[PDB]
Enzyme design. Structure first.
Site, PDB file in Angstrom:
ATOM      1  N   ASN A   1       4.225 -10.615  -2.607  1.00  0.00           N
ATOM      2  CA  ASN A   1       4.704 -11.194  -3.992  1.00  0.00           C
ATOM      3  C   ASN A   1       4.984 -12.758  -4.298  1.00  0.00           C
ATOM      4  OD1 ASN A   1       5.954 -10.660  -5.899  1.00  0.00           O
ATOM      5  ND2 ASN A   1       8.013  -9.604  -4.785  1.00  0.00           N
TER       6      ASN A   1
ATOM      7  N   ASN B   1       5.823  -5.340 -10.442  1.00  0.00           N
ATOM      8  CA  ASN B   1       7.299  -5.310 -10.225  1.00  0.00           C
ATOM      9  C   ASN B   1       7.730  -5.404 -11.188  1.00  0.00           C
ATOM     10  OD1 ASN B   1       6.629  -5.173  -7.426  1.00  0.00           O
ATOM     11  ND2 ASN B   1       6.630  -7.104  -7.024  1.00  0.00           N
TER      12      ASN B   1
ATOM     13  N   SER C   1       6.988  -9.850 -11.956  1.00  0.00           N
ATOM     14  CA  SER C   1       6.005 -10.221 -10.564  1.00  0.00           C
ATOM     15  C   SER C   1       4.894  -9.647 -10.126  1.00  0.00           C
ATOM     16  CB  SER C   1       6.888 -10.680  -9.222  1.00  0.00           C
ATOM     17  OG  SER C   1       7.410  -9.803  -8.862  1.00  0.00           O
TER      18      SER C   1
ATOM     19  N   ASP D   1      10.273  -7.157 -12.507  1.00  0.00           N
ATOM     20  CA  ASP D   1      10.823  -8.644 -13.109  1.00  0.00           C
ATOM     21  C   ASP D   1       9.143  -9.429 -13.573  1.00  0.00           C
ATOM     22  OD1 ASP D   1       8.901  -9.065 -10.645  1.00  0.00           O
ATOM     23  OD2 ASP D   1      10.890 -10.278  -9.912  1.00  0.00           O
TER      24      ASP D   1
ATOM     25  N   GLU E   1       2.313   0.690   2.662  1.00  0.00           N
ATOM     26  CA  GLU E   1       1.972  -0.219   1.671  1.00  0.00           C
ATOM     27  C   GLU E   1       0.801  -0.764   0.513  1.00  0.00           C
ATOM     28  OE1 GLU E   1       3.941  -2.813   0.409  1.00  0.00           O
ATOM     29  OE2 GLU E   1       5.954  -2.324   1.573  1.00  0.00           O
TER      30      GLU E   1
ATOM     31  N   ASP F   1       2.058  -7.499  -6.402  1.00  0.00           N
ATOM     32  CA  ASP F   1       2.544  -7.561  -5.406  1.00  0.00           C
ATOM     33  C   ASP F   1       0.607  -7.626  -4.572  1.00  0.00           C
ATOM     34  OD1 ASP F   1       4.950  -7.258  -4.683  1.00  0.00           O
ATOM     35  OD2 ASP F   1       4.883  -5.171  -4.473  1.00  0.00           O
TER      36      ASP F   1
END
Ligand SMILES: [Cl-]
Ligand SMILES: [Cl-]
Ligand SMILES: [Cl-]
Ligand code: NA
Length: 129
Positions: free
Chosen positions: A59, A46, A50, A48, A35, A52
């Site tokens: 998220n 991301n 958002s 959309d 990760e 991380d």
């Protein structure tokens, strides 16, 4: 902070992730590796809108507030920046809520695709725990 492999294993164990919800310590270290590459300061945007955050890439759509993800939730009740600290307490405590929500560690795409069904014990091998 960029953690060493056994260094992170020890910290995660102290904070109670070993066998948490039935997931052995090797799973958590494997997830963190793919990760974030063990980097607490890791961020990724991301599609959309958002973002991380942190060693476990939590998220902002659901779990933390960064003030730029309209219509999102803050289920861990923390600012997303807190997930970037050299102290992993906030990330671990939030991770505990995520893995408890019904879908287990499948919430982490890297775990599902790169850790699930492998010899995860190898990730804590040689570590003084
Ligand atoms: Cl393990
Ligand atoms: Cl927001
Ligand atoms: Cl499960
Ligand atoms: Na949010």
């Amino acid at each position: 902070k960029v953690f060493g492999r056994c260094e992170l294993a020890a910290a995660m164990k102290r904070h109670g992730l070993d066998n948490y919800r039935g997931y052995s310590l090797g799973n958590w270290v494997c997830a963190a590796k793919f990760e974030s590459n063990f980097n607490t300061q890791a961020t990724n945007r991301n599609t959309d809108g958002s973002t991380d955050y942190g060693i476990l890439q939590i998220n902002s759509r659901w779990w933390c507030n960064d003030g730029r993800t309209p219509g999102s939730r803050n289920l861990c009740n923390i600012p997303c920046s807190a997930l970037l600290s050299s102290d992993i307490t906030a990330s671990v405590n939030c991770a505990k809520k995520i893995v408890s929500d019904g879908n287990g560690m499948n919430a982490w795409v890297a775990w599902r695709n790169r850790c699930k069904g492998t010899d995860v014990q190898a990730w804590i091998r040689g570590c003084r725990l």
